[PDB]
Design an enzyme around this catalytic site. Structure first.
Site, PDB file in Angstrom:
ATOM      1  CG  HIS E   5      -1.964  -1.099   1.083  1.00  0.00           C
ATOM      2  ND1 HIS E   5      -1.480  -2.180   0.932  1.00  0.00           N
ATOM      3  CD2 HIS E   5      -3.201  -1.264   0.657  1.00  0.00           C
ATOM      4  CE1 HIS E   5      -3.100  -2.962   1.452  1.00  0.00           C
ATOM      5  NE2 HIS E   5      -3.436  -2.438   1.252  1.00  0.00           N
ATOM      6  CD  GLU E  77       1.529  -2.548   3.149  1.00  0.00           C
ATOM      7  OE1 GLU E  77       1.958  -0.675   2.748  1.00  0.00           O
ATOM      8  OE2 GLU E  77       1.089  -2.898   3.249  1.00  0.00           O
ATOM      9  NE  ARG E 165     -19.092  15.311  16.740  1.00  0.00           N
ATOM     10  CZ  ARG E 165     -17.219  14.429  17.300  1.00  0.00           C
ATOM     11  NH1 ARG E 165     -17.317  13.335  17.016  1.00  0.00           N
ATOM     12  NH2 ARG E 165     -16.460  16.403  17.882  1.00  0.00           N
ATOM     13  NE  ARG E 220     -18.984  16.190  21.143  1.00  0.00           N
ATOM     14  CZ  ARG E 220     -18.987  14.744  20.871  1.00  0.00           C
ATOM     15  NH1 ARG E 220     -18.356  13.660  20.881  1.00  0.00           N
ATOM     16  NH2 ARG E 220     -20.577  14.515  21.144  1.00  0.00           N
TER      17      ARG E 220
HETATM   18  O1  LIG Z   1     -14.232  15.363  18.619  1.00  0.00           O
HETATM   19  C1  LIG Z   1     -13.066  14.612  18.134  1.00  0.00           C
HETATM   20  C2  LIG Z   1     -11.964  15.526  17.455  1.00  0.00           C
HETATM   21  C3  LIG Z   1     -10.851  15.143  16.668  1.00  0.00           C
HETATM   22  N1  LIG Z   1     -10.969  13.827  16.419  1.00  0.00           N
HETATM   23  C4  LIG Z   1     -12.245  13.054  16.690  1.00  0.00           C
HETATM   24  O2  LIG Z   1     -12.118  11.517  16.741  1.00  0.00           O
HETATM   25  N2  LIG Z   1     -13.091  13.685  17.662  1.00  0.00           N
END
Ligand SMILES: O=c1cc[nH]c(=O)[nH]1
Ligand SMILES: O=c1cc[nH]c(=O)[nH]1
Ligand SMILES: O=c1cc[nH]c(=O)[nH]1
Ligand SMILES: O=c1cc[nH]c(=O)[nH]1
Ligand code: NA
Ligand code: NA
Ligand code: NA
Lengths: 251, 252, 251, 250, 251, 251
Positions: E5, E77, E165, E220
């Site tokens: 790859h 790899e 989310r 978050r």
């Molecule tokens: O909230 C995020 C920000 C960057 N990368 C992720 O996986 N989640």
């Protein structure tokens, strides 16, 4: 050589390589009589076995009983006797509001809420029908004039808690199945029944061709009770479709 | 008032019965009921043949379950809906210990849960165990009949073939999970294979219902895979006498 | 010849094939002094080992410590020295309203909320007592005059979150165990303890005979606190019962 | 006010927020005496509790007994009484050929072959020590002059089949654990013990700082060790954990 | 003689036994140009590969693309060509309120919410970094002036439902991940990303040294979609740190 | 608004409700040029996005990168911008002797040997294509002149151990995957790839239509090395087929 549960021999099948497999023993004669020269073969436990001829070719009709365990025995024993194609017809409960009583469902894949599927393939394996059988079932069902839905079927080892029914003796549903109907609904699952996961998984992993067609006898989201007339018609149409699907499978 | 969905009987039909004998085979139902007083056919739909009878002056239901946990669970649920609280299963089994003979009886003290329906009532951690009174009654009934009786763990499988590690099949293959499984259970002291006990015992033990399982050995797997039809009739007569006597013990 | 943890030899046991196995090292002498000619053998870690004579036959009394891991060591090492029968005694907390302080529980099966049982059998295997041992315990408990409950025990690897206690440092319970006490309650489970799933699974799968009897000294559903005289009477009763269960097991 | 099993109160600990938690109740006094003013507090079941002073600060030494279940009780109850840091000390058996008797192992992570860990976090959660505790343990282990191994420990709910011992009553090992030792060896796992997965998962998911250090006393792969080497390893192990604790306190 | 790859040869690496492995192929040139004699080697799919020199020693810089599957290919790899040390740099979302955008996180262990880790070790195995790499990354980050956090990272096979989310096409999260963010929060988990579980498990079980450092681009506890304005500066800081971490691993 | 990873807006798509999704960014233009008015929209990470027109209707072509995680992001972000139908094209390695280089496979279901599928539905859920898409793909493949196989595909989070390759750095495969290729072969599975399980599960459970068509570049059971002329012919054929499959889906 007589198979242990079904009580038939290979000679009894008269060269049949295709079986129609309803759930209810009482349905076997009805299906057989839609074809030519129906012949009663045996009746043991939930297994009623008939032979008939479709377009000159011998076909077997064999009930499965309820659940994957009893279905798995019938399929295995018919396969020992040379059957390679299995056409499932049964009743089903719809769980989507757009799906009406009298409609027909052809399963494109099953949620494996059973135990027997796991005796043939790990959980990762898809409970998928043979593409030719599913294609024939779609064709036969649509050509019959019925409203037909292709999609995912939730296949349960129970009729009650596994289909999140609360009107029961305990009125309880185990954690795993609490909120599960809403979950399947949101995932676009069409219906509940109790045999497809086992049937499709065992056949797809064992070099046998299988599919499922189902007549909708109830909708879990609907308050209206279907009348006797609609149910009779639905049951008549279901078996007409499965025979015509079988005709399409013959070569 | 209400007719249950599958069994097609009413609570009135059962005449106050709180105990059922639940064989697998519909044909065995009448045969059990006639060992009791005043047997009456009630209904027959799909794999479900229902009779009522009287045992020492008390109403007793006899109802077939069909093969497997899913079919069995429907019958138990619907019978429980109509007031049944105690369930005695009688059936056939294959022995996996070499010392157990064809014609012997096994009373299950616990089931290996190789089924799916048990998980619809309780997580895998929950024990698939009988009511102690039913298991005690079955042992006593079995002994008093002259039978050789074994108490122990039963492996309860959702299949007759690969889950019981049978190789004389269409594919001749057994999925990874079940390869070497019979010898595993054997070394662990498991006595036998059948197909309904895990679902029945888990469902009942977790739902406030009493249940037990007694079985007639029709095959020993250290010899062969497919049971002989001979000695099957002989085994079945003893089995049903044992279960009716077990039911008698339960009714006090 | 000398086992790794217990510090005793086959000779030290004087031909005993039955062990009474309490949890607490402090209880070993008390149990042993109920029988004849009690002899101290060894004490290492949580393992205090005594020998005694019951109706002329040598009996071993050995503590297990808390939890399945410690228990699994003791049972294995006693089995290496010829012990075949294991009688677990203890005190426990009930989760059913109807179960009172001073009642006895004989375990007919254990919910496997532990890890060590999986080192002996996969989860599908039932954590079930030997039938003779369960029978002997039921008889001993009932003959003592106590109210006796035969039923399922939830056997947890923790005292706190696995028994859904919130009165803790973090005041949190992991998702798996949220709502779990009420789930067990609705399923008819009688009590929580911490060793039976390991003991029963290991023995049932290893050709050993085992059972569990416990005196109820507290109820998770009752606000009322048991008085001192009852607690000590229950503890005294528990150990008399197990010794009488042992008497019933000798042949 | 007085915790259920340990039989001590918060007042009994004299403001201690750090605990050294050996497995064996007999090792408790031996660790406590390495510090100032050791005092026996309580002994119930497998839990022997002592208090001591290290550099003017109160420290608790408390045995856990064998296995995650008994450990989980000790840690929880000590936490209720204000203990926020837990240092595990022991002696262990190695499974790697390069690891010698007398070496120290500091666990960077544990294979969770237990059950109690799952009572705190799902299996996907890593049984990982606090980085400061592991750093302090490595330093103290090196400062003692021993060869120190940083790596993964297999933490088993059993001494026998879970560590793939066949020299047993049945001589059988359940499918799950058949071939497991070679598996862990090939994956670079250093050693077997019985408490770390529970300890580390529990603390890492509950806002508590934890780590594990252990003197090597036997090697599953090496045919053998001298008595003088063994008591020196045991002495070194507890010397190391006390010095690890000193680093944690300032 | 090229790996399947990556399209590089061992000669292409010019003796490098350490690789810096960012996610985004655009960061590959940036990282290489922080070092001496940067040379482009190859670009195929998500894999951009550069060579550079750090204190006279060859280092490989190779993108991983998003997720454990593509990361697993790159690591394998590069290992085939002689790389033994892997320094992951990436972006991350904080789930603890005290962790600000621009902060650096060094992973001490990963929650395995991926599938590729299971292709190397069973779930019980810890997704833990090599201690030396984690120590070097902490030192590099602290020495650079950044605010650094050491702790557990939740490593997810998805960006959306697995990181809980809801601002998505369906607005729905599967049962497994409902309430999961608060669960991780309550457990002290620092952050979400998508490669560390795979990388760390693979390497810890394969005799390779690996660690992960990540720049916080979002908190978050505030929002789901990262602000564009702060990415550039955060990424500049992250790559400064990983290069310094690499300097510290050179032997 | 512009989606976070793809860097495109809804207006960018010009009303497109169908996407063709190859793995390789370099394939995107090659697919787009088979249609009318192809226009480059964006390129970030492994996501190269083009828009084109097919029989007067807007179509999107978007690379996914390798593996389910990267794919899940692309599908989700396109779905936020109105895409409802996803046609995957790619390369694959067959594990059945009857499957030749130059043949094509239309996946009827996938073995879920991935992690991302679980973030959308539990393992019991079937990784199944939309029936119309699979039908359209079969028809397009057949009308191109190629031999087409309908069947089960094993979808793995790794290229190496998950596809039971031993020619690797460690030379070993974790227990779970030992003997697994032979298992799949005996179960009739046609091939290995790395994205179908995630794609099909997320779409089937999220009200999106999806399917997978693939050209066989290599057979794990054959010794014969395929010609350069063959491999290029099959690459070209695969993309022609998926564009034709797209035409069938539009009207
Ligand atoms: O909230 C995020 C920000 C960057 N990368 C992720 O996986 N989640
Ligand atoms: O609701 C229903 C109807 C038929 N069959 C089922 O399994 N469920
Ligand atoms: O072997 C046997 C015999 C009867 N019933 C079974 O399930 N298995
Ligand atoms: O063997 C192969 C070939 C292409 N892609 C894969 O994932 N596997
Ligand atoms: Na049945
Ligand atoms: Na202990
Ligand atoms: Na990728």
């Amino acid at each position: 050589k007589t198979v242990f549960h079904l009580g038939v021999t290979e000679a009894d099948l008269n060269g049949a390589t295709l079986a129609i497999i309803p759930g209810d023993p009482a349905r076997v004669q009805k299906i057989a009589e839609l074809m030519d020269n129906p012949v009663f073969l045996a009746s043991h436990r939930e297994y009623t076995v008939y032979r008939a001829e479709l377009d000159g070719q011998s076909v077997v009709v064999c009930s499965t009983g309820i659940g994957g365990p009893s279905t798995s025995i019938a399929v295995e024993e018919l396969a020992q006797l040379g059957v390679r194609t299995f056409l499932r017809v049964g009743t089903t409960g719809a769980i989507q509001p757009h799906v009406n009583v009298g409609d027909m469902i052809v399963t494109t894949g099953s949620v494996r809420l059973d135990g027997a599927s796991l005796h043939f393939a790990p959980m990762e394996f898809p409970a998928v029908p043979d593409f030719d059988v599913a294609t024939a079932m779609k064709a036969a069902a649509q050509e019959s004039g019925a409203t037909v839905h292709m999609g995912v079927t939730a296949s349960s080892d129970t009729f009650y808690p596994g289909q999140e029914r609360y009107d029961t003796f305990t009125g309880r549903v185990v954690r795993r199945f609490q909120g599960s109907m809403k979950e399947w609904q949101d995932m676009g699952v069409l219906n509940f029944e109790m045999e497809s996961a086992t049937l499709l998984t065992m056949c797809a992993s064992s070099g046998l061709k299988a599919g499922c067609v189902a007549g909708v006898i109830i909708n879990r989201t609907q308050k209206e009770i279907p009348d006797h007339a609609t149910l009779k018609e639905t049951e008549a149409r279901s078996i007409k479709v499965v025979v015509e699907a079988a005709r399409k499978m013959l070569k």
